[PDB]
């Protein structure tokens, strides 16, 4: 398992404009276009994003594309953190792939936010970064998801996502 089948999961893959759960436009395998509520501000983000006439509809070639530059600018937004990559460097490598699902996901500046759950992780107090990081808007909105990443970190094996 990897950080690419683990957010696959995580996200699904959908070729159409779409509204993810926080009701913001959408499309591919979580690709965030727009915050903005008009579908206009949402096919316009999209073509300039792929580089042509989509109209709300893309490839897997193109999904997948969008995908690597996402995961990719991931990596490099928590390794440029400096409330982040200090974290990076203390986990191991599953672990490391719990923290790139969140910052994919929540961006880099909100889970720069969960300081304290940051500090139990780096030191290494598993069961209670756990239960700290269960204690947000995050765990209350999307519960699955967040628990399989919580487990992640919890036990650092792929054991929650073996499952799906």
């Known amino acids: 398992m990897n950080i690419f089948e683990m957010l696959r999961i995580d996200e699904g893959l959908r070729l159409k404009i779409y509204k993810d759960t926080e009701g913001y436009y959408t499309i591919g395998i979580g690709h965030l276009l727009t915050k903005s509520?008009?579908?206009?501000?949402a096919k316009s983000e999209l073509d300039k994003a792929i580089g042509r006439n989509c109209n709300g509809v893309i490839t897997?070639?193109?999904?997948?594309?969008?995908?690597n530059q996402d995961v990719d600018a991931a990596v490099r937004g928590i390794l440029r953190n400096a409330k982040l990559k200090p974290v990076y460097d203390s986990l191991d490598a599953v672990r490391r792939c719990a923290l790139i699902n969140m910052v994919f996901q929540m961006g880099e500046?909100?889970?720069a936010?969960?300081?304290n759950s940051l500090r139990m992780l780096q030191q290494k107090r598993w069961d209670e970064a756990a239960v700290n990081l269960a204690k947000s808007r995050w765990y209350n909105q999307t519960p699955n998801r967040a628990k399989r990443?919580?487990?992640t970190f919890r036990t650092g094996t792929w054991?929650?996502?073996?499952?799906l």
């Open 60 to 67: 897997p070639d193109e999904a997948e594309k969008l995908f």
């Open 113 to 115: 936010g969960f300081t």
């Open 37 to 41: 509520p008009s579908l206009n501000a």
């Open 159 to 163: 054991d929650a996502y073996k499952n």
């Open 149 to 151: 990443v919580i487990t």
């Open 109 to 111: 500046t909100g889970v």
